[PDB]
Amino acid sequence: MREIVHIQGGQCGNQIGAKFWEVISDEHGIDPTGTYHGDSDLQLERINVYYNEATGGRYVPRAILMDLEPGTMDSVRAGPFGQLFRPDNFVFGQTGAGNNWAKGHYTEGAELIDSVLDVVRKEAEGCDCLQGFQITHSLGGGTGSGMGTLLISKVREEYPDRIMETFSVVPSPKVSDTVVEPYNATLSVHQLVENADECMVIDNEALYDICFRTLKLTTPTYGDLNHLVSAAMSGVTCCLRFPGQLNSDLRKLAVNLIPFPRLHFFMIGFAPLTSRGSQQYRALTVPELTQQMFDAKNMMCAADPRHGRYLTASALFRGRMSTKEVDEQMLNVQNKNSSYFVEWIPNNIKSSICDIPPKGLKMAVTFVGNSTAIQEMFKRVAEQFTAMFRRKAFLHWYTGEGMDEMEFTEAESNMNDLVSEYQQYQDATA
Amino acid sequence: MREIVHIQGGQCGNQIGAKFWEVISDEHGIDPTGTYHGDSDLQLERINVYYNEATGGRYVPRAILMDLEPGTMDSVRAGPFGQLFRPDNFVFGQTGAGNNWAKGHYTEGAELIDSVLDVVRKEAEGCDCLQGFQITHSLGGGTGSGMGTLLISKVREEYPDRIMETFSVVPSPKVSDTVVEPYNATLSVHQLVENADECMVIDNEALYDICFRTLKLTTPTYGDLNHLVSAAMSGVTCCLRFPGQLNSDLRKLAVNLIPFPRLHFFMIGFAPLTSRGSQQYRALTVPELTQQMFDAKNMMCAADPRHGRYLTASALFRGRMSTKEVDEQMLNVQNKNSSYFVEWIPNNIKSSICDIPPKGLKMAVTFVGNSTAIQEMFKRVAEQFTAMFRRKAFLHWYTGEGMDEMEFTEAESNMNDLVSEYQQYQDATA
Amino acid sequence: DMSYLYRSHFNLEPVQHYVSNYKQNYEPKAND
Amino acid sequence: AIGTQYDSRKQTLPMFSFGKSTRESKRGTFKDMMSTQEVRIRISMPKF
Amino acid sequence: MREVISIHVGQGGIQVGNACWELFCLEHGIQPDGQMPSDKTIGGGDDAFNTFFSETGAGKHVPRAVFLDLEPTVIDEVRTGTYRQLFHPEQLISGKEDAANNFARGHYTIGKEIVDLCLDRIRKLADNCTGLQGFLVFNSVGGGTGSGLGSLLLERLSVDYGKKSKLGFTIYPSPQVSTAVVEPYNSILSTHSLLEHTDVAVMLDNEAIYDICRRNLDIERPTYTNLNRLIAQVISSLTASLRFDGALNVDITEFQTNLVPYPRIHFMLSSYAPIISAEKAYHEQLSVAEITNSAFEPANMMAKCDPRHGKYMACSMMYRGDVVPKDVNASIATIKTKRTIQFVDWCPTGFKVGINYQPPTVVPGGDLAKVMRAVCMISNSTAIAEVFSRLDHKFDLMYAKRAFVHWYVGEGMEEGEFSEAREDLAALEKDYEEVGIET
Amino acid sequence: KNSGIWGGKFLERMNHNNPINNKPYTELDFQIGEIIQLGVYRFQLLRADEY
Amino acid sequence: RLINEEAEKQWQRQNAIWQKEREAKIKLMHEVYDSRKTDIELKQTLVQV
Numbered sequence A, B: 001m002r003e004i005v006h007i008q009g010g011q012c013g014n015q016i017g018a019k020f021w022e023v024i025s026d027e028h029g030i031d032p033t034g035t036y037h038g039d040s041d042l043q044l045e046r047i048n049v050y051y052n053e054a055t056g057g058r059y060v061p062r063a064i065l066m067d068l069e070p071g072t073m074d075s076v077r078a079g080p081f082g083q084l085f086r087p088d089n090f091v092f093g094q095t096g097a098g099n100n101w102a103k104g105h106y107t108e109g110a111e112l113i114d115s116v117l118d119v120v121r122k123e124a125e126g127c128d129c130l131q132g133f134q135i136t137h138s139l140g141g142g143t144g145s146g147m148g149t150l151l152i153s154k155v156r157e158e159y160p161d162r163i164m165e166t167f168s169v170v171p172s173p174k175v176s177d178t179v180v181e182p183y184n185a186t187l188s189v190h191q192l193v194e195n196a197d198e199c200m201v202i203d204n205e206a207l208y209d210i211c212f213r214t215l216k217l218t219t220p221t222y223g224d225l226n227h228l229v230s231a232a233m234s235g236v237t238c239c240l241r242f243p244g245q246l247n248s249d250l251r252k253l254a255v256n257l258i259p260f261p262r263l264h265f266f267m268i269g270f271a272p273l274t275s276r277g278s279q280q281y282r283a284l285t286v287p288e289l290t291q292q293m294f295d296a297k298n299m300m301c302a303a304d305p306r307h308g309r310y311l312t313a314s315a316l317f318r319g320r321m322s323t324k325e326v327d328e329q330m331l332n333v334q335n336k337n338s339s340y341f342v343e344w345i346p347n348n349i350k351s352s353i354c355d356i357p358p359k360g361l362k363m364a365v366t367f368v369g370n371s372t373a374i375q376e377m378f379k380r381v382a383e384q385f386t387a388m389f390r391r392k393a394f395l396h397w398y399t400g401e402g403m404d405e406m407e408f409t410e411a412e413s414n415m416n417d418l419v420s421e422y423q424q425y426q427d428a429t430a
Numbered sequence C: 001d002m003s004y005l006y007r008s009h010f011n012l013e014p015v016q017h018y019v020s021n022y023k024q025n026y027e028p029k030a031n032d
Numbered sequence D: 001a002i003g004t005q006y007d008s009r010k011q012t013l014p015m016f017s018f019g020k021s022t023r024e025s026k027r028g029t030f031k032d033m034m035s036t037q038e039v040r041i042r043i044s045m046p047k048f
Numbered sequence E: 001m002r003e004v005i006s007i008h009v010g011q012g013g014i015q016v017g018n019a020c021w022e023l024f025c026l027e028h029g030i031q032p033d034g035q036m037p038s039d040k041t042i043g044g045g046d047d048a049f050n051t052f053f054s055e056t057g058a059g060k061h062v063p064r065a066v067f068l069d070l071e072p073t074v075i076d077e078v079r080t081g082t083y084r085q086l087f088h089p090e091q092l093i094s095g096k097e098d099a100a101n102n103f104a105r106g107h108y109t110i111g112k113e114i115v116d117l118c119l120d121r122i123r124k125l126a127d128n129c130t131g132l133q134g135f136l137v138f139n140s141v142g143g144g145t146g147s148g149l150g151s152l153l154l155e156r157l158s159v160d161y162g163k164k165s166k167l168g169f170t171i172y173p174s175p176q177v178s179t180a181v182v183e184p185y186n187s188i189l190s191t192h193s194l195l196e197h198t199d200v201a202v203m204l205d206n207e208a209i210y211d212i213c214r215r216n217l218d219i220e221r222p223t224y225t226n227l228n229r230l231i232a233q234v235i236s237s238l239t240a241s242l243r244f245d246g247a248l249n250v251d252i253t254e255f256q257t258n259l260v261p262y263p264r265i266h267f268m269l270s271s272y273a274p275i276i277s278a279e280k281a282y283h284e285q286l287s288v289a290e291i292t293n294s295a296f297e298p299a300n301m302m303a304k305c306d307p308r309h310g311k312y313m314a315c316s317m318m319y320r321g322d323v324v325p326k327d328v329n330a331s332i333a334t335i336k337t338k339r340t341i342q343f344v345d346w347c348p349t350g351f352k353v354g355i356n357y358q359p360p361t362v363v364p365g366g367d368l369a370k371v372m373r374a375v376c377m378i379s380n381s382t383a384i385a386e387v388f389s390r391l392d393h394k395f396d397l398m399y400a401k402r403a404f405v406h407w408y409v410g411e412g413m414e415e416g417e418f419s420e421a422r423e424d425l426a427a428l429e430k431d432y433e434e435v436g437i438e439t
Numbered sequence F: 001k002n003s004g005i006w007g008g009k010f011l012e013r014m015n016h017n018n019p020i021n022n023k024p025y026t027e028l029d030f031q032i033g034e035i036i037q038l039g040v041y042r043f044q045l046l047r048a049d050e051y
Numbered sequence G: 001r002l003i004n005e006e007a008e009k010q011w012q013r014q015n016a017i018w019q020k021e022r023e024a025k026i027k028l029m030h031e032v033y034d035s036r037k038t039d040i041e042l043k044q045t046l047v048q049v
Ligand SMILES: Nc1nc2c(ncn2[C@@H]2O[C@H](COP(=O)(O)OP(=O)(O)OP(=O)(O)O)[C@@H](O)[C@H]2O)c(=O)[nH]1
Pocket: E009, E010, E011, E012, E013, E015, E016, E071, E098, E099, E100, E101, E102, E140, E141, E142, E143, E144, E145, E146, E147, E171, E173, E178, E179, E180, E206, E224, E225, E227, E228
């Protein structure tokens, strides 16, 4: 009941999904051949949230993997847990987009979307009662940034009331893995602002800093990055799958988080995290958990929260703890940080509790915060984009496929308007 | 009781029969020597439908094999289960028609048909109670497309009240192997529409696509194509030979699928069909069977059903199932896709259930849909016919043995009028 | 082998799978 | 019983719709799971 | 299901194709006979060799290459060498009369009779592929036949196939060291021809790699084979990501969309590292920071140009080995911080990065040694205008007195053909100095 | 490698005796596979150097 | 179960034909190459004479 399907696209999207399904299967005790071997009774009560039943008692994920080149899927299948995925659900292109938003949104993806939209319609329809969709994609690659946003547009035009959640990897200028990142990033965000019910941003630079500074591990890997993202993803929807003191699903968070329709870009955080050499030194308590939630370095986004003011915050706890300790700690922090919280909104922290912690953990926390501080990354990408665009750099590769510079002008204007409106509330007073 | 005899002609029809009788023998537990070795005796209650009893306790098919060339008959005699057939019913010429409809319908077919008509009338009068007759043939070849139709007209002339069924394989322009196909196809359809009570159209191109796509096998053969066609043919009359919740014989289908006398060209399909690799991934349920039968790509014709609207639909279920799911799925699918269903006829889908599933499958479904989408194949065949006919290409071969261009013009006019009248009910509104 | 680069290196460490509702059970009955 | 009813006990059954994917809408790949597995054998080459 | 097709025209092209096809066969495990060892027993498999080879259904593998030449000596040597069993007997197209460094002969007189067979073979080879990624073309530019046939081939392919990507690996004549005396004329004509017809072109002049061999490999007496080995290793570095799994995969189509600011600017210069002999390779750790520094010091450039003399537009880098993206980011940060490297103002970011796992292989009896990490970089920068300027001065000094002009006029080429090439080169120089100015 | 403990020098250069017999440790006690109690930490000598 | 035995038997009979055509093709292929070989040696032996 109120189950959700999974849609992922692009190389980064497939890599995210390969570990997200890994961690969820570990949580629900499913072996890589798909047969239940769990211990607790609760582990099977809410299986249908992510899995479908098949004859012989096997479970199959309801996920759809799309990409414009076959190599990524051919690689991800061969790994562990790769046999769970239904073979029919792979949708793919034979040429690729080559980091071109025009190619991935106008020429090739437009032709390819028929099959993937058919299969997503089938998977959504087969479900009992829909809750919403989640997408994972990166804004630095052309094929992802185009195909994902165009699919979002069409799926919204078909399901106006269901909730949509998007996990966007945005390119920071420090780790700039592609020279054409600003173009397709701005084009993607322009379409995403109008359609995405929720978007949460993830920064590779912030992941790298966290892995180097908190975990104290020498050489991080993309596996560790995907592991962090997977834990964060599981923390949000653990409530939907397990009973708790205050269950709070996606619609709850959506209605309770966004003051205004066009401000739905969040940054998230997870706790606790430590090296095993300090894993026994630390004492797992609610004050420790809140200290680690609201520490600046814990956020996996490059935005500094102390440079702006929080519009609102939300914390979901996992494990058994008293409601009094949680509420009193929240009130204490809200009183001690009166400067960084916008004054005209009273009691702007949401709390939720789930009794089943992550495997191996006694307590844990996933945090989602909406603050005015994320304007810095928009301003930076806008500056880089206008630096590219004033001299018409790389422009013909995009304009040769039916797209013109009027769309570029409109996208820049809309994003600038968003930034100005988003800082408008920052200095608003009552 | 109330049985039906089998007549086949032409190479394609003989190859169809060679697999149809074999699969029927498998279903009824009969060895290639004609001695029962089945496990149940339900397999013997209605053995009178196709098999006659001979002294010595053996069973024989009641099939009449007729051809103008002995090569195919000699080849099919040597195959497995080729000893069942009565040696007497084999009737064949000495020259062949040379893919010439005129030669196969006017000169040699007329002089030869006396013997085959005598044997078929003997088989008919010997029986207890006649249900009708069924034919399997292809319209792309001269000998079949001519002499089969002449036999159709003759048989109707002595049995005005019996039901008459034909499986016609029509030549699609994609898989084209004879340059004179449009001429004989149009000439055969002109005669078929006036006499055949039921016709079902099969396209090699559609079969080839089904084999390549849903079965995911690289190198099919005519054996596999014949297997699919034979399974489809058996599923139509399974409920006649076996008990069920709602038995419904061919006369029931004729009553419930024919709005007007001349609209009797159906397209059929079978479910489920899955690849060997995904055989154990799938879960067999009534929603799966219905969504697979109503899929566009599963249809055995090249016509795209969503280019038009269904007039009537019929579903024949096999296995242990209850009326709830069947009836409600029909209602629900008709409600959800009301745009593709004609409106001035309410509840335009019939369902029937048989308790004995095919050997090896728990559930099975045969789908027969009379829809206005088949106008495309008629349009294409008429276009090719008139394109070849404007220059009087190949016309001297037909005009040298009795017919003239007047009959060709009449056939074209009747064909176009059929197209116009068939499309007339598409746009009609209540 | 690339096992040094495929998998993660995370360690985060029974009878912890009972609902908080399972504080509700048993408790037998105790002039002029 | 013949429509949509809501309760934690009893579920709602699906209502499929025909797709708009063409007969030839590209997409291939993954020839590892085929029925045939076309034949490969070994013969040594002559030295010419 | 991804394939590319390679063209080798000119004697230098053939001699570098020999080296590259040695390296690819060695890397993929096919013996010179063309048949993989029966002891290895690979069994059922695909991809890998599929990028460059095509399976015979049962046995040997045909490289997806074609060799073109008019002088048969090199082709005869190949057909009598140890690789005579590998290549197809009718894909080694050889003529009878050499162009003799005459561009007019190779563009108007005798190449027309060979180009038809070449295009027929190209069509036959392309009909086999289904996921064609693009074309590679190799040709020495200072040779008449190579330049003329390459120009004609590109001109025909641009209209025969259209939007398919092509990469040109040209060896420009060196500033002061040269073999013949007539290179300037045919070089300028070839550049004019290829300017509007190649998507990406790379610089492969001689003295630069010659100094590389002198300094790093410590070879006082090198021959063309060592240079061909170096170029082959660079080709392997470029094409590894197509046929081997990596965390950040980059296709050949991911170049014209990331390295080309304007359709006119598509000439680029490359570097590779490390280049260390086995006697001293194991004395140092060869870590990512120093290797990516070595990729950038001007002395290790594969083109005789000073990057210090101009601004950068874009650098695209491939790493192969056990390198990690954290170290890659750390090195890129230091490179950005360094004050001796300047990027253009309208490109605050200019780095494209790709990562692949398979370490580069060694050729036994070769010069380079086993190293677990390697990086190959391609840069587009404004400094390349110097070579165009120097060849312009060279061509002007000659065209002033109209020397050797009859050797081109008498073969059917119009007299003023050199003029439009000169104005095109002037326009290219103007475009370079125009994009080099800040805002 | 690639696990991240702040490892290093665990005990410093110092000399101390065995608690049971109250005599200083010598070469005889340091035999491979023996159990030595240094202060509070007990160690088992797994493998030794070739020298 | 009773469904599963019938399914297994169907699959066995269907696999038999694929097997049969497989050995037919592979022996044909062996004959093809054995016939290829026996002319090149004739060419060399004719060269000497
Ligand atoms: N890098 C490299 N360049 C070579 C090699 N051999 C020749 N060249 C260059 O090629 C130029 C002349 O062209 P060649 O490739 O030798 O011959 P060609 O291109 O077939 O033209 P023709 O000599 O007229 O037949 C010379 O100036 C050399 O610089 C080589 O082995 N490696």
